[PDB]
Amino acid sequence: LAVFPEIFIINATFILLIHGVVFSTSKKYDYPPLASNVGWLGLLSVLITLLLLAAGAPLLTIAHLFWNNLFRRDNFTYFCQIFLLLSTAGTISMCFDFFDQERFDAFEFIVLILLSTCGMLFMISAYDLIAMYLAIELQSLCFYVIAASKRKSEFSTEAGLKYLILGAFSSGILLFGCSMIYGSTGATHFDQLAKILTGYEITGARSSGIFMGILFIAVGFLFKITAVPFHMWAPDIYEGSPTPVTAFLSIAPKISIFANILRVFIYGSYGATLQQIFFFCSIASMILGALAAMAQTKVKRLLAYSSIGHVGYICIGFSCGTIEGIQSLLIGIFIYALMTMDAFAIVLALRQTRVKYIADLGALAKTNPILAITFSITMFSYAGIPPLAGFCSKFYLFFAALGCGAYFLALVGVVTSVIGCFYYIRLVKRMFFDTPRTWILYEPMDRNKSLLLAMTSFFITLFLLYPSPLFSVTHQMALSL
Amino acid sequence: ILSVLSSLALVSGLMVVRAKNPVHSVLFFILVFCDTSGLLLLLGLDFFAMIFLVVYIGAIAVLFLFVVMMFHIQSLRYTVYAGKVRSWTNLETLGNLLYTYYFVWFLVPSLILLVAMIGAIVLTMHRTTKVKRQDVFRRNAIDFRRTIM
Amino acid sequence: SLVWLEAMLPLGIIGGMLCIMGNSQYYIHKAYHGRPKHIGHDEWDVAMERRDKKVVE
Amino acid sequence: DLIKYFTFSMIIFILGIWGILLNRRNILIMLMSIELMLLAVNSNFLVFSVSLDDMMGQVFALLVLTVAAAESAIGLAIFVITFRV
Amino acid sequence: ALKEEKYAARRTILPILQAEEDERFVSEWKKYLEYEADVMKDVPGWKVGENVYNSGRWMPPATGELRPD
Amino acid sequence: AEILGIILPLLLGVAFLVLAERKVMAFVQRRKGPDVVGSFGLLQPLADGLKLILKEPISPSSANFFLFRMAPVATFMLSLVAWAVVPFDYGMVLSDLNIGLLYLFAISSLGVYGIIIAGWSSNSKYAFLGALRSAAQMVSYEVSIGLILITVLICVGSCNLSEIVMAQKQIWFGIPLFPVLVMFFISCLAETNRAPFDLPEAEAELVAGYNVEYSSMGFALFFLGEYANMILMSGLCTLFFLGGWLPILDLPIFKKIPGSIWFSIKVLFFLFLYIWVRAAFPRYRYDQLMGLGWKVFLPLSLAWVVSVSGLLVTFQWL
Amino acid sequence: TGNPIPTSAVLTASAKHIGMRCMPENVAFLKCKKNDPNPEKCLDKGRDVTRCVLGLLKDLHQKCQKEMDDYVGCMYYYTNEFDLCRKEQEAFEKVCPL
Amino acid sequence: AAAAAAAAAAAAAAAAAAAAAAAA
Amino acid sequence: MEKLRMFVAQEPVVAASCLIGGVGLFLPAVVRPILDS
Amino acid sequence: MLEFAPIFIYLVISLLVSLILLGVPFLFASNSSSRFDIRFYLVSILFLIFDLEVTFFFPWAVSLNKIDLFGFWSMMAFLFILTIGFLYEWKRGALD
Amino acid sequence: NTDITALEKAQYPVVDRNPAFTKVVGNFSTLDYLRFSTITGISVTVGYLSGIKPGIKGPSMVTGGLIGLMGGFMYAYQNSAGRLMGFFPNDGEVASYQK
Amino acid sequence: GWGITGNKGRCYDFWMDFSECMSHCREPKDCTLLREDYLECLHHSKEFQRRNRIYKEEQRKLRAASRK
């Protein structure tokens, strides 16, 4: 046993896939638009998976056969795997409206999202290089298809091709690293790998073959999370695709990759090389994002760059070896995810507006004044303004970084937060104080999208009154590795 | 002398990345795969040689040929006679593992082939079946029918 | 009636060619090597052939 | 001799990544080089499995075969869709 | 049953073949050690003649990848 | 070497198979086939040949000599090299490969190249699309032949063709898996074109469906290739399913039991079945044909791998 | 073939007898090898198995030599393949050593 | 292509003469 | 069932493949555990 | 591998034979007497997938006494996933 | 080979290590049959309710019920197994002390 | 640790020693003797470095004799 939570989502995907194709290819049902019927059913398939994974959390480690030769499930994986499904479900909740407006007959598009979640669930628990690569391939492959869903419009398909090549290269680079890592280790399991690589220290103890592999595996992961050293065309992918598909790739693959990153590198590899590369990436991502937030104008692209800047703050936790720092990274991932879902949902709130600049998004003070305050909260959360939940996560990242001793890295993060805040007050000024740009009038959304904002915006502000639970949850996960 | 003739694969791999005529690119692609299978034969991995042949130069570079033809781009050994009494052919000693011990890394490539099927369907159905061959779709009551042009 | 034999004759002289395909590459290999070909010729047998040609000195 | 059968695969992989870097304009050569480098790591797994006398190499090489093949399938199908009608 | 008969015959003649190979390889090893101690002259070279074990176990010396293929 | 002793007799076999087909398919139609040229048309193949050789070209066009003047060479070399592993009698295979079957599968996967290239070098849109359709057919009935061989492989231990014909000493796999022989034959009919399944080979669409520069050598080599591919794919329905070189084992006093003669008799039966089934059945239209390789011979082949695997796993018959 | 030269054919031909007899020497050699695979450490047990087996061959060579000379003719003709001549195998086994 | 495919199903064979079998 | 017979008549080869294949997915499912004697 | 050398020379000797069959007609007889059919990409990708799954069938075919009733069921799970893919292709209508 | 030996195992008193199917499912408490029943309902209700839009209410309800059966049954199985094995509260030791 | 011809592989025995000695091992540094022996079985690097010097000293004498 022990694979039942993953088995259910794979079975649920197959059952939805058979239901969608048989029904969609039905003259009797007049070839109906299954998407949105596959939806709701798809959202509850994730929710049933969430319950099964949570229910069997003590039972997850049922047998040595699964952990030693296939995948190992641990307390850290369970807490993040629960979050991964919740992140996936939250994205589906905002996405349902997009399915309704679009002529979505793509029942398969939901099955791809569930298949991606199954790949992501296998990715979090993957304990072998073969398993991690195969799981990464499935999650990315499902994602490649979602990017090219709007075939009639070349803008989505061309964006998909750049995402596909970046994905193929990232998987391929990681694969080459596995080959080199395999050559020295003689085994592909992370557990066997850790025994050979424990305290390898490429300066203290010679390890030419292992390092050659480690260099490739680390580089491949960075392309997947849109790290700035390998950001490449990844920011382009975010703006070119419509906002809802962009949201799904924005949070769920990134969270899965970050959780996979901590497991593959901290436990398996012990050299003074892995922490430093993230430290350089963190400084660069925040610097690139801060420059980009001022440089970028389109609201969708700006969100991607703000997300890239936040990704750098997340990277610092791995960069500082302290377990408290790894915990701080987890606090950041959760806050960034809630804000990223909230931010995409506010953009999704202005569904009526076609692609438009920030100035057009302004003038929301007179109309939808509460939404205007809600937009201000979303920008503030990435900005690092103190009352919001993001600052508390950043302060833990910074407090851990000061304890870790990363004064230079910590300072640039504060400086990048400072660089971001000026644009955010300017954006807040744009919303109410100035640049209304025509007094444009917006349209309503579904209750689920409003609740995504309601359950998140209140929580972002409520974090100050009761911040203890999240901090407790995050450290437990870091210690488990 | 055929050992060092991997130089053929080496130069043909340099051709595909330094060729503007796509027919030469795919030809030297096929050549790279043929010489890589020659190599995998010299190592005695007979199964992988034939699998390279089949699933590379009978399927994948077939795909690539299609993409070119259409859509043009423009002494001292001590042999231990134990473990030789029952010589395991490469297929048998891949099947003793892939289907019983590491079988989940074999059911996951199952899911990857299934995702490849679903992908080749959802991508290259090309509006040629129920994806859009459902109907043009029309509704009379909303239709103006000459009330509005 | 034996009328079908005229149409059997080309199949015969195409069967008399697969017999030759089979026996030629047998009696040619039975000539270069004093013994018939070994079908199930696993590595045990090549090792024993090596040590055998090394035993007859 | 393992070095001869590995550094040759290593520089086949380098050819693949080189063609990736140069040919950002043409995509069919991009996919050519993708399958090239997914061979130079596949042939690498096979060579390292014969050298180490270990079967995990060949299991992983077979799975990379039947994963890079699906990757080429989806890649070329995406490339054909990219050249819309 | 035929394959088990063949394998039983092979396993039964295995000790004789392995004894012949042991004698032959140990003779080649004696001559290789008397060559090493002669090419090294024993003052400048490997002050220990064989010293191949590298831990408490023996292994056939070394070769390429796969000769029998 | 002794590759002459397997290519020359096979060349004579193909040359006399053109006559065997004309003559058998004629006898079926109540008419003697080629009957004046030789004593019984036995020289008619040599007459067809010596005619095609003495026919002046329509245009020399020796300039384009590396593109499609070696593509028929490739098709024919593949159809002839898949004959190495085919064993005619115990220890009469030219090269006993321990993965023999998979090698045949690879040779087919390269024959796909042969067809595609020799059709693309013909700068005729109709002929090139015809060659592409023929390649897609030859490769769509290759997943079905693949699974049929996986069945006959589950029954056997290994892919060694000499073992697959040695694993039938007790009973030919034609008797228990007869439904499979019918599917391998109806696939080998469709893998090769010569079949009820030959719309790309509809009498006219074939000639104008392989090349533009004939010069006779191209016409003969394609037909010599199709007839060798046919002798081969009939020499597979007789290794796998019929007993490759095995008698019925009654051990007669009249019969001294030669092996290659039994292999010959069986491959003659399957060649005669190729002819008979070309005579008596209408063509499948290539639009029902491709919908027969996917919707009929793949499900009925997959079922057979699960049936012959199940029934051999439950009762330990493996 | 000739004097009891332990060729491939004459060894795989008498392997039934090398199984019935000389089983203690074989199992002792195998016990050594599975204990430690260094060739020297049971060079003596190698001499012991080779001694009893050369003796077994010279016994088989001395008695019913023509049947043994026909069976090893088989095993050299068909390379140690048993089924290809069960007639010689029975003749040789039936005449003297069962 | 949405072209009407030739569905090879139909009603079973029943030889249909004209009404003038016996008495015009 | 009426629709079952309508499916084994209209499509004989996918209804006699899910039954020449049941005998293979059914023999080792139940007939093998039965063979405990 | 040892038995691969006969076919290794077979390729070259058959090359010679076909070159002679090419040169025979050349010597004698002197002076005086659709935008795109994507279904060919669907059929092609689908053959690719089904030949990958036959590649996975081969070791399971030749080694099925070793994997007693567990390798069989693992392969039947792989095959049920193949069948789900093939039924999604049949219903969606790629087999036409 | 395989073995049901678990990490973090036997936190509660085991009743039957490695319970055989047809026993771990015959151990369904009236809570498991109430978990397997509420999951199948929330999966039929969502399945029918999702299909009101495309006209597939019946068959989408049936496929939601299939998903619910699979999921709720595997959940009831998780519960009754982690109960029979030493993983869950496991107050059903009276069934062993009595039988 | 299965191998190309199986037969328990070749370095599984060395991995078995490295893993047995990696049970509750004080530190990898303490058991590195088995890991290096295990790596040596995997790549034969220790034999190669000695082979290069045996070749070099023999070559150095031969090269010195040739140069004269």
Helix (H, G, I), strand (E, B) or coil at F252: coil
Helices (H), chain K: 32-50, 58-84, 94-98
Residues ≥6 apart with Cβ < 8 Å to D83: B71
Kindly report the nearest CA distance between residue K26 and chain A, in angstroms: 18
Kindly determine whether residue E9 and residue G82, on different chains, have CB atoms separated by under 8 Å. Answer: yes
Report the C-alpha gap between B46 and B33 in whole angstroms: 14
Report how far apart, in Å, the C-alpha atoms of J88 and of each of A22, B121, F66, J47, J84 are: 8, 9, 44, 15, 6
One-letter identity of residue A107? F
Written as six digits, the tokens of A7 are: 């088995």
For chain F, the first-to-last Cα distance in angstroms comes to: 39
DSSP F70: S
Q: Which residues pair with A357 in a beta bridge?
A: A298
| The amino acid at F97 | L
Strand partners, A71: A126
| Whether the Cβ atoms of residue K96 and residue K31 lie closer than 8 Å to each other | no
If we measure between CA atoms, which residue out of G69, K66, F143 comes closest to residue J47?
F143
D-chain residue closest to E67, CA distance: D50
- DSSP per position, D20-76: HHHTSS-HHHHHHHHHHHHHHTHHHHHHHHHHHT-SHHHHHHHHHHHHHHHHHHHHH
- Name beta bridge partners: A39: A42
Is G69 exposed, middle or buried (CB count within 10 Å of its CB: 0-12, 13-18, 19+)? middle
Resolution in A: 3.8
Name the E strands within F164-229.
none
Question: Residue J35 corresponds to which amino acid?
Answer: R
How is residue I29 annotated by DSSP? I
For chain I, the helix, strand and coil percentages under 3-state DSSP, each to the nearest 5 = 70, 0, 30
Taking CB atoms and an 8 Å cutoff, what residues of chain C touch F17?
A: 10, 14
Distance CA G23, CA G16 (A): 11
Strand partners, A126: A71
Identify the H or E element spanning L66: helix L45-67
Burial of F59 (0-12, 13-18, 19+ CB in 10 A): exposed
Q: Do chains E and K touch (3 or more CB pairs under 8 A)?
A: no
For residues C51 and C46, give the distance between their C-alpha atoms in angstroms, rounded to a whole number: 9
Q: What whole-number distance in Å separates Cα of residue F200 and Cα of residue F190?
A: 11
Contacts of L16 (CB under 8 A, 6+ apart): L1
Q: Do B57 and F113 touch (CB under 8 A)?
A: yes
Angle between helices J71-92 and B104-124 (to 10 degrees): 10
What is the longest distance spanned by two Cα atoms in chain D?
A: 51
CA distances from A257 to A246, A260, B126, D77 (A): 16, 5, 33, 26
SS3 of chain A = CCCHHHHHHHHHHHHHHHHHHHHHCCCCCCCCCCCCCHHHHHHHHHHHHHHHHHHCCHHHCCCHHHHHHCECCCHHHHHHHHHHHHHHHHHHHHHHHHHHHCCCCCHHHHHHHHHHHHHHHHHHHECEHHHHHHHHHHHHHHHHHHHCCCCCCHHHHHHHHHHHHHHHHHHHHHHHHHHHHHHHHCCCEHHHHHHHHCCCCCCCCCCHHHHHHHHHHHHHHHHHCCCHHHCCCHHHHHHHCCHHHHHHHHHHHHHHHHHHHHHHHHHCCCCCCHHHHHHHHHHHHHHHHHHHHHHCCEHHHHHHHHHHHHHHHHHHHHHCCCHHHHHHHHHHHHHHHHHHHHHHHHHHHCCCCCCCEHHHHCCCCCCCHHHHHHHHHHHHHHHCCCCCHHHHHHHHHHHHHHHHCCHHHHHHHHHHHHHHHHHHHHHHHHHHHCCCCCCCCCCCCCHHHHHHHHHHHHHHHHCCCCCHHHHHHHHHHHHHC
Contacts of B78 in chain G (CB under 8 A): 39
Question: How many Å apart are CA A470 and CA A334, to the nearest integer?
Answer: 9
Q: Where are the beta strands (DSSP E) in F62-186?
A: none
Rounded to the nearest angstrom, the minimum Cα separation between L23 and chain E is 19
Compute φ and ψ for A298, nearest 5 degrees.
-60, 135
**Distance separating the N- and C-terminal Cα atoms of chain J:** 42
User: In degrees, to the nearest 5, what angle opens at C-alpha A354 toward C-alphas A351 and A355?
Assistant: 115
Tokens representing A128? Answer: 């072998």
Contact present, L15 and A187 (Cβ < 8 Å): yes
Query: Do F151 and F301 meet the contact criterion of CB atoms below 8 Å apart?
Result: yes
Return all residues near A205 (Cβ < 8 A) that are at least 6 apart. A199, L32
Q: What is the DSSP letter of E30?
A: H
Residue with tokens 């595609």: F116
Residue L33, classed as helix, strand or coil, is: helix
Do residues A7 and K43 touch, judged by C-beta distance below 8 A?
A: no
Identify the DSSP state of I28. I
CA angle F226, F230, F234 (to 5 degrees): 175
Q: Which chains touch A (3 or more CB pairs under 8 A)?
A: B, D, J, K, L
Q: In terms of C-beta density within 10 A (0-12 exposed, 13-18 middle, 19 or more buried), how is residue B93 classed?
A: buried
Q: At residue D48, what is the residue type?
A: F
G38 touches C: beta carbon within 8 Å: no
CA distance D37 to D14: 8
State the total domains in chain A.
Answer: 1
B2: chain E residues, CB-CB within 8 Å: none
Report the SS3 class of residue F214: coil
Q: What residues are paired with A128 via a beta bridge?
A: A189
* Distances in whole angstroms, Cα of residue A253 to Cα of each of A53, A80, A85, A120, F194: 19, 13, 11, 7, 52
| Two structure tokens written together for J80 | 């049920």
The first and second tokens of residue A5, run together, are 């939570």
Contact G92, G64 (CB under 8 A): yes
Q: For residue B116, which of A144, J74, A74, F88 has the smallest C-alpha distance? A: A144
Q: Say which amino acid occupies B103.
A: F
Helix axes L12-20, L28-43, angle to 10 degrees: 180
Q: Report which DSSP code applies to F167.
A: T
DSSP reduced 3-state for I25: helix
Give the residue carrying structure tokens 């036997």: K10
Nearest Cα of chain I lies from the Cα of J39 at a distance, in angstroms, of: 22
Rounded Cα distance between F167 and F152, Å, is 10
Is residue A127 within 8 A of residue A118, CB to CB? The reply is: no
**Cβ proximity of K90 and K34 under 8 Å:** no
Residue with tokens 């003779």: E27
DSSP 3-state of H20 = coil
Q: Phi first, then psi: what are they for G28, rounded to 5°? A: -70, -45
Query: Chain B: residue nearest A135 by CA?
Result: B108
Residues contacting G84, CB < 8 A, separation 6+ = F90, G74, G78
Q: Which residue in A171, A179, A212, A219 has the most chain D C-beta atoms within 10 A of its own C-beta, making it the best mutation to test that interface? A: A179
Distances (CA, A) of E26 to B84, E35, E60, F192, G49: 21, 14, 11, 58, 17
For residue A43, list its beta bridge partners: A40
DSSP string, chain B: -TTGGGHHHHHHHHHHTS-SSHHHHHHHHHHHHHHHHHHHHHTT-HHHHHHHHHHHHTTHHHHHHHHHHSS---------STT-SS---HHHHHHHHHTTTSTHHHHHHHHHHHHHHHHHHHHHTTT-STTTTT-----TTT--TTS--
Interface residue B87 vs chain C (CB under 8 A): yes
Separation between Cα atoms, residue G74 and residue G91, nearest integer Å: 12
Cβ atoms B46, F97 nearer than 8 A: yes
The rounded distance, in Å, linking the Cα atoms of E53 and F299 is: 58
CA count, 13 A, side-chain hemisphere, F307: 21
Scan for tokens 């488990």, then name that residue: A480
Q: CB–CB of F173/F240 below 8 Å?
A: yes
- The whole domain housing A421 covers 1-481
Residue D75 to residue A164, Cβ atoms within 8 A: yes
- Tokens of residue D43, six digits: 């042939």
Contact (CB, 8 A) for F148 and F183? yes
CA distance C28 to chain G (A): 15
Per the CB < 8 A criterion, the answer to whether B26 and F116 are in contact is: no
**CATH code 1.10.287.3510 for D3-82:** yes
Where would I find the beta strands (DSSP E) of E4-48?
none
What is the Cβ-side half-sphere exposure of residue A139, based on CA atoms within 13 angstroms?
31
Provide the token pair at A161.
């091709």
Between CA A293 and CA A315 the distance in angstroms is 19
Q: How far apart are CA K44 and CA F159, in angstroms?
A: 50
Asked whether the beta carbons of F218 and F72 are under 8 A apart, the reply is: yes
Q: For residue G52, give Cα distances in angstroms to E6, G4, G19, G45.
A: 22, 13, 12, 11
Q: Is C44 helix (H, G, I), strand (E, B) or coil?
A: helix
Instruction: For CA atoms G1, G4, G8, G13, give the dihedral sign.
Output: positive
Contact L32 A195 (CB under 8 A): no
Closest to A314 (Cα-Cα) out of A301, A326, A302: A326
Q: Which residues contact A196 (CB under 8 A, 6 or more apart)?
A: A184, A185, A186, A187, A210, L18, L35
Q: Is J81 left (phi over 0), alpha (psi -120 to 50) or beta?
A: alpha
Q: How far apart are CA E25 and CA E37, in angstroms?
A: 18
Look up residue L9 and give its two tokens.
């592989």
Sequence-separated (6 or more) residues with CB below 8 Å from residue A45: A8, A9, A12, A13, A16, A114, K67
C39 to each of C26, F103, F161, how far by Cα in Å? 12, 16, 9
- Cross-chain residue pair C56–G78, CB shorter than 8 Å: no
Question: CA torsion angle for B4, B7, B10, B14 (degrees, to 10)?
Answer: 170
CA distance A323 to A46: 30
Burial (CB < 10 A; 0-12, 13-18, 19+), residue F37, is middle
B98 touching L (Cβ < 8 Å): no
From F102, F139, F158, residue closest to B50, measured CB to CB: F102
Question: What number of other Cβ atoms are within 10 A of residue B43's Cβ?
Answer: 21
d(CA A466, CA A458): 12
Per-residue CA distances from A450 to A46, A96, A177, A380, K73 (Å): 21, 13, 44, 19, 34
Instruction: Indicate contact of A with B: 3+ CB pairs under 8 A.
Output: yes
Nearest residue to F120 (alpha-carbon basis) of F85, F74, F151: F74
Assess contact for L3 and A148: CB atoms under 8 A.
no
Question: CATH for J4-92?
Answer: 1.20.58.1610
Sign of CA dihedral A460, A466, A468, A469: negative
Beta partners for residue A42, in sequence order: A39
Is residue A12 within 8 Å of residue K71, measured between CB atoms?
A: yes
